[PDB]
Symmetry: C3
Subunit: 437 residues, 3 copies
């Protein structure tokens, strides 16, 4: 209760700083309120402050509504001027947390937009491990929030890139310990110790990490999920009279759903693009939901969340070689029917629950039919690698996680009355090579 | 023909005795016809005669409609008086068969109502073996009818409880021989001999029995299924002018379906309970259908037979600490669209049928699509334990049993025109831990 | 372009010869145009010319409409007279290609009508390998077109029949080389060499061939598919003014679809038979589609192509002991909504594509549900026989073949605008023994 109030205070301070920074940048650039709430403008401004910290100038495309048409202009700012605007919006401090928050939003968007199969094959990883690749476009030396948000496969990928002096060993051991904390079984954690304790890591460590990544498809790791929104949402809220420091804020509770319910974000739309599909993409990004079950996402949103291959849309960002005369703008539908708490858990990994159910029928009636039985489960019952294999063999796609937990009405602020839903799952399952759904 | 007439005669005598006993008890208790046909009253009266044979008094709750409300009263009878009423309703004889018949009805209800996962984990058994647990609430020393009705897993459970002087060996060998007769493959039967022939049975016998139980999920055993109805149904039929001795009776033919079609049973309903769900529960119990494919049960009944976890109902029996002022009564819908012969068979166990079908496609047209193939079947082709494993590996959920046999119209008394149906299967498949359906 | 023109020329010559032959036979027999376009008459005439080449007389049932009824008459022709009529319709030449073309049509019909499970069990083959049995009713010494059209399992079957002097060795090695050319992986081809190089082939070669046949269910071979129509279709087109020599013709392009769109074929219908089901059977035969995915066939045809066990129809040919007074005739619906190029390819066999997708989810929200993952795929990653096993283990029913290729509008003659469809698959999957669909 008091610990939550304290967390909400610091998060609320962070969000307030991003908001004031964005308001300042909008006034500097003389953008209208609508233009300030165009997501492409928000991404440019976010990129500029990140570039300023992460000639000595930074910039990008800024889009204005001029004479009934959308116009693109490349603006340039001194990196030192941007740094001063950020620091002073955050009351003198560097506020690295706000920067990392915007990085995670960018990361969550990239996770929803692009598949990193090229990066995966380069590191010797299965391109089908995408659900483990949360935060893979984040830098290696990210923040505490960045490390928490990164998937098991992202950590594996970064660790193999290390394998392929004194500061290199500390970085290697730190990343092993980050990965270890994500694993929910002792057997997986022990294998990470065996990789961490390796003097001169090589092929044996590579193989162990690939093994661990594949185990995390079934024995999933604890990855944090944070709803991180474009800076324009925070800026527009601060400007309109919302005080994030007095109200507090949460990345995992109702707050971001309530905030999106009271916001209006815009997007540039290419010809032949569906705005609803652009909306779905950004909504998924907003709630870090790229690798979620599409059934869960659909039920929360209230409209079908379709696979990536069914979306009639390209990326949010507009390339510099694209024609602006064919560009239209529309509202992004970023609201939801319900809301749900964002989890750090990877679900159940305990295979010794002595779980109750039914995996066969016994015929009562003399009637022609096939006799259903759960083959893989029945047949499954017949050092650390072999234990992990056995734990994976015990697991079933049917096994239920998050028991008793449900979605909530937007009016249910205290999360008192959970709605447990009656349950195509893979967002990246629909491509020209695989029909995984 | 003559053997069937002889069986129908003895069964008809048994049913007549139960009927006359129940009529007598209803007059003793001064119950109205409606009250006599309340299933909770029937269960109490059934329990009293079973307790009298299986201070020196027996009793239970009897429910009466008094001043527009349902009232509960605890009655007590001398066990000797009940025994005299039972014996004399059965023309002087002990009639142990009628008692066992009522026990099987109770067992079939328990199988439909409760899952015995606690009893299973105590004996070292997988709680998912529930479909093998028919008759598990029956006493070890039941009747011939009780032994026939018991599932493979029930026999395994009882045998492990033995493992955990001269009369103990005979009981052990008898139960091994009961189990052996249920198995349809020689390899399974041989393993039971190896368990039976064991001097000082222990852990090796325990492991063999667990192995055999799991094999019975695929290579299913021959378990008898008997439609055993509450005593009020038999009593109401005898009273109304049906002579079971002259007509004969069958537990596995059309008779019980015809009887339920001409009967009206009632149940106490708690607030917020669906009467149709209470009806489904009792209908399943009546025809020993707890562990049947829900598709088969649905097609016969004519209405959807949903999983236990979807039923808005608790048990039939009302606890002594429940409030009677909130209790209502309603008719139990125990009729069916069709009827079907109850089987003793566990389906096909012969894996050497050289069965015809198709497990892959060959592309004819140059069109983008996935290429379907039956993976587990294709990959499967690459002493007694290993043979059983191999037989289990050969089996498929798609394989058809009871070829040429179908359901029947209620008017089709001779079962001349079988309706073969075009075929969620697990009744206990829908819980907070597993979504098996 | 020039190679295609050359192929179209020779194929067009072949089709023209069959057409002129059939016209001649119709005039000889004094059949009306409608009677000539009855498929049963076409099959008899086709059989007669094949028998004449493959006392010294040949014949069969010819059906005429006489006095409002269908009448059967057994006609007999001198085999030498038929041979002269065929040769002279083909401008003096033997034209063995036209004969083989009619044989393939007969083969494609047999593949759609009958399952050869008896022939399969006699050769030690799995009756479920039917999808590999294209061209199994064709003679061993068929043509070049006959060899190309034969399935992997057909070649295996013929090779085992050889196993069960100098000319026998050449025939054995030729058939091994035919089979080898069908395999798309080097590992499969190498095993065929090891069977071919065997002095005195026996049980070891038998086992290798059974292994190879089963591998072809997953690592499918390159089998040719040719749309071969009843001779009455070609005859009716030539008679109506279509010049196949000037227009050219193709067995794998749009031509046969265009030809069927401009044709009208009839069939004798038994009482209680659905004409639409008779139509489906002949349509499948016409396009060599017995072993295709029923989803692909359905989408092309524009109406549901149901499994064989759902078809209310027997074979096309009428037995000599059947009553003609109950026979009716109807139009065969042999048209299609779309068309598609017939392929020689067996789909993708390359398991090293580093294919992109998703085989698990990572939970974002704290909500009760099961957590989907692709079990067989995840678990799969944990000399020539073992490599083939490993390649089979890598394959998935979800993997996509023929990428970028689609169906076409009947008006799209050049195949410029492919329609890729959004994808019950087995035609022989619905029987009393197996529910494979
Ligand atoms: C209650 O009204 C106000 C409240 C505050 C300020 C102005 C108004 C206000 N003044 O005038 C009108 C009109 C107003 C109004 O109705 N709204 C709608 C809600 N809205 C808003 C709400 C939330 N959060 C929660 O409510 C919440 C509730 C429970 C837990 C966690 N969070 C967040 N957030 O969580 O980020 C962002 C926004 Cl923008 C603020 C404006
Ligand atoms: C044919 O009518 C009678 C028949 C007998 C007694 C009275 C009547 C009768 N007297 O007046 C009316 C009115 C009556 C009447 O129509 N019914 C409905 C059927 N019913 C009934 C039927 C059966 N069985 C079979 O019919 C059967 C048929 C074929 C095989 C196996 N079993 C069972 N049984 O099997 O347990 C219980 C009952 Cl209660 C008896 C009363
Ligand atoms: C364009 O019209 C004619 C054309 C020719 C002869 C007579 C007529 C004609 N004279 O009067 C009328 C009226 C006519 C008419 O409209 N049709 C319909 C089409 N039909 C027909 C078409 C084809 N093939 C293609 O068109 C094709 C197109 C592109 C690639 C491959 N093949 C085939 N074939 O491929 O086997 C069989 C037949 Cl029977 C011939 C008669």
């Amino acid at each position: 209760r008091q610990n939550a109030t304290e967390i909400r205070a610091s998060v609320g301070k962070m969000i307030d700083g991003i908001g004031r920074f964005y308001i300042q940048m909008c006034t500097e650039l003389k953008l209208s309120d609508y233009e300030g709430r165009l997501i492409q403008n928000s991404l440019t401004i976010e990129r500029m402050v990140l570039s300023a910290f992460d000639p000595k100038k930074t910039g990008g495309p800024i889009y204005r509504r001029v004479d009934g048409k959308w116009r693109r202009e490349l603006i340039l700012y001194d990196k030192e001027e941007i740094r001063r605007i950020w620091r002073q919006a955050n009351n003198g401090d560097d506020a690295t947390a706000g920067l990392t928050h915007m990085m995670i939003w960018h990361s969550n968007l990239n996770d929803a937009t692009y598949q990193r199969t090229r990066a995966l094959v380069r590191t010797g990883m299965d391109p089908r491990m995408c659900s483990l690749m949360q935060g893979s476009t984040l830098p290696r030396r990210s923040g505490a929030a960045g490390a928490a948000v990164k998937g098991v496969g992202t950590m594996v990928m970064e660790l193999i890139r290390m394998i392929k002096g004194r500061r290199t060993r500390i970085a290697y051991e730190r990343m092993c310990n980050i990965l270890k904390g994500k694993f929910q079984t002792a057997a997986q954690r022990t294998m990470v110790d065996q990789v961490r304790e390796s003097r001169n890591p090589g092929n044996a460590e590579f193989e162990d990490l690939i093994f661990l990544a594949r185990s995390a498809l079934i024995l999933r790791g604890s990855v944090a999920h944070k709803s991180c929104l474009p800076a324009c949402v925070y800026g527009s809220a601060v400007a309109s009279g919302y005080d994030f420091e007095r109200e507090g804020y949460s990345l995992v509770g109702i707050d971001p759903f309530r905030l999106l319910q009271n916001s209006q974000v815009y997007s540039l739309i290419r010809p032949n693009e569906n705005p609803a599909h652009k909306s779905q993409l950004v909504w998924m990004a907003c709630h870090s939901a790229a690798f979620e079950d599409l059934r869960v996402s659909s039920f929360i949103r209230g409209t079908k969340v379709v696979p990536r291959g069914k979306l009639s849309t390209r990326g949010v960002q507009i390339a510099s070689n694209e024609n602006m005369e064919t560009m239209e703008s529309s509202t992004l539908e970023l609201r939801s029917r319900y809301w749900a708490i964002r989890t750090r858990s990877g679900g159940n990994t305990n295979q010794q629950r002595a779980s109750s159910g039914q995996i066969s029928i016994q015929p009562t009636f003399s009637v022609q039919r096939n006799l259903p039985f759960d083959r893989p489960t029945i047949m499954a019952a017949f050092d650390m690698r072999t234990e992990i294999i056995r734990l994976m063999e015990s697991a079933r796609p049917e096994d239920v996680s998050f028991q008793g937990r449900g979605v909530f009405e937007l009016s249910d602020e205290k999360a008192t009355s959970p709605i447990v839903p009656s349950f195509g799952s893979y967002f990246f399952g629909d491509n020209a090579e695989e029909y995984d759904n």
